[PDB]
Ligand binder design. Sequence first.
Ligand SMILES: [Ca+2]
Ligand SMILES: [Ca+2]
Ligand SMILES: [Ca+2]
Ligand SMILES: [Ca+2]
Lengths: 203, 202
Amino acid sequence: EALKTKEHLMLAALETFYRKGIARTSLNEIAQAAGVTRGALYWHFKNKEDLFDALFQRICDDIENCIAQDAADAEGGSWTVFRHTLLHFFERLQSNDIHYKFHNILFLKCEHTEQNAAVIAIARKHQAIWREKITAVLTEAVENQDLADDLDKETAVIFIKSTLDGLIWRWFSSGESFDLGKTAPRIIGIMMDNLENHPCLRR
Amino acid sequence: ALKTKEHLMLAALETFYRKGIARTSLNEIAQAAGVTRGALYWHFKNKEDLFDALFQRICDDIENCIAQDAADAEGGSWTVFRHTLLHFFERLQSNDIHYKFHNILFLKCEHTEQNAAVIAIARKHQAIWREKITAVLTEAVENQDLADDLDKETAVIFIKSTLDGLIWRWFSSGESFDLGKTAPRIIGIMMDNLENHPCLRR
DNA sequence: TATCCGTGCAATCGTGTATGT
DNA sequence: ACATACACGATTGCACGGATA
Ligand SMILES: [Ca+2]
Ligand SMILES: [Ca+2]
Ligand SMILES: [Ca+2]
Ligand SMILES: [Ca+2]
């Protein structure tokens, strides 16, 4: 008991959200996904939004802690370390079951409408995490002459997450039709090479 | 006579875009069209039947405008293909119906196995781009525009992901950036990598 | 008379809160 | 904490019934 039911209720909620979406997922389906009733759900959570928010926020913090861990230990500069940060992320996209469903639901299994304020609150918070990490490593790379001096970083930060979102979207939408273990390193390498070399990324 | 059926169908497109797909009752579609559920049930079996006919007519029109500016443009396969993408991203800002078609397909629907209509449309839109990209890539090396050892398997995944990435980011940002200026840049970069990057070879 | 569209009603489903250990 | 019971709204599907041409 105690946190045991809370933990099992969260993952049963995450499992049901990934398989049958969020709109068609009743709170009773969440309850009997675990071994409890809605009386145990309403004690631990206010309503459906309060559960989705509590579930998806703790996951969103894990991904930025998994990033902060996998990135802080400076093993070879920062621009080359940022390379290892993105690939450990895509590696966790396949191994980490919780991190995998978090993105699959945010991209395919929920609707981004103002009426469901919980998902855009997570969508805006997911974007706010990446954009801050991207702008941080862009300056410390120019301050280290790893990239150019006149780098259009406003275009570059849009350029970075745009291509990484499309790989995430393409992999999920294709039903994992291709190998993310061999494609993501290729896509990341081509991306960072354009930041280093392509002229239309500057002013 | 037939003026109320067309009013109902494009009232569904607007309501799908504002409130999502699931959070819209058949009553809201009818009242947004100036009718009630009697005219909606007379023409369409249910909401999935209404979402099917609406998004199958738009998807086919997209296929022609994506194929019109192909036979319109005279020139080499690899250069008339860049203009095919630039005119496509322009229709995201010029064609309101086309803008809502992608925006609903990307942000305001659940791609889950129970939604048998969204997945059927999502793969129809994929096979359209899959066939067009594979057909331009095969004619590209028969013209010496791209290298002969080009990884054709990785290339269309690289092409489609970069394309969908700009579309998702533009929508998910709330149209936060100029699509008329960022699309030409990232399309030129995507094609410069097909011609010169070594990791796209075998 | 067939097609078009509004109206009334049964019936299911999800939620919220009170009730009882 | 957690299960159970009740009260209520929100949609859905087909009953129709009236209208038109
Ligand atoms: Ca369900
Ligand atoms: Ca609604
Ligand atoms: Ca070239
Ligand atoms: Ca009447």
